[PDB]
Structures are given as C-alpha cells and as structure tokens.
C-alpha cells in the first residue's frame, strides 16, 4: 500500500509525522531501524494538554505466518495489521486514518 | 513439573532419551542451550525402518503472555502446552507420554 515507508529513521519518521496538516491518526509503517525483522506502526497523537506528539508502536514477527502488536490481536499479514486498526482502535492511541506525506513541507487539500 | 530439565545439552537430552525402556513419547523440557529465552520440547520417537530416535521442538516465546511451537496452536504457560499435546498429538511425532528419567541408566518398573 502507499503506507510502507521502508527504512527511515525514528526520527525521519517523527519530522514528517509532526505536520500540523496532519490528521489525528495518521500513519506510517516502517522497518525496525537496527533491531530487525521487525517493524514499526508510528501514528501522530493529538492532545489539548501535551498538543502533537507521535507514537511508535512495535510490529512484531510470529517467525510464521503472522503479525501482531498485541499477543490478543493477531494478523496474517500487514495489509490485515493496517485494515483492522483502520477500523477499530483496540487499545492504540487511535484509529488509523490518513496516509503520512513525503513530505517538504506538504500542505493537504480538500 | 517433573518434566522441566533445565540447562541440559542436546546431547545430554538425547543420552537420556536413547533408554530402551522409555515408551514411544517420552519427553523432556530443556531451556535453548545458547540461543536463548526460549525452549525445546525433546521426544522420544520409534519406526520400525530408523528405530529408537528422538525429536527436538522449539518452544517459542511470545515476549508476552504466551508460548507455542506452531503459531496455530498457542498456549498461555508450559503447562498448558505439555498438557495439550499430552491428549493430542497435533502434528507432533507422538503424543506425550513419559517423563523422562534422570538417569543412570534407568529400568522402568511395572
């Protein structure tokens, strides 16, 4: 999907992800920056108190078929991973919702 | 339980194993001699063809609540999986039986 950011930086990741364009629950999906073979769901947060923030969320390998965040929640793959907490929160931060940008530094339509 | 054997080597599990007088499905559980964290689930195994011979699983952890040697099949603690494939066997060689002796070199009463 568009959403497969490949190998950047936490940081990289946190530059683009702190847009103030973006909406609440914007993602990426990224490689686990030197502790491998796993990934990274990184979504912006928004609060009143503490104002955008992101959060990284770990994706881990079941050396199988699977993936998961949580041992409760399981997928086969990240496509299932991304479409389910697109529709459901389950104990995230927040459901997801917009693709992150590229950025440089990019301004959304309507 | 009896079954858990600790840091015991490949080795030293399959010398133990190799008894005559351990009934197809004797097993052990050992820790993962240098690559660890996880386990091994040792059984011993008989055809007719190859004879006496014995079967290592890794026993997977979920870092979490959880283990498993197939992602279809999890258990929350060793327990549970011991006394799974103690009543099924599921795709392994055989169901689970003995535990293992200790051993020197055992005979098995009636």
């Known amino acids: 999907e568009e959403w497969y950011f490949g190998k950047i930086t936490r940081r990289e990741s946190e530059s683009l992800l702190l847009n103030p364009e973006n909406p609440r629950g914007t993602f990426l999906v990224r490689e686990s920056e030197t502790t491998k073979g796993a990934y990274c769901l990184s979504v912006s947060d928004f609060d009143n108190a503490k104002g955008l923030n992101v959060k990284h969320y770990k994706i881990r390998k079941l050396d199988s078929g699977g993936f998961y965040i949580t041992s409760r929640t399981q ?3 990240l496509q299932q991973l991304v479409a389910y907490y697109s529709k459901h929160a ?3 931060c927040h459901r997801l919702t917009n ?3 590229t950025s440089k530094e990019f301004i959304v339509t309507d």
């Open 75 to 77: 997928f086969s793959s």
């Open 90 to 92: 389950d104990g995230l």
């Open 99 to 101: 693709v992150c940008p």
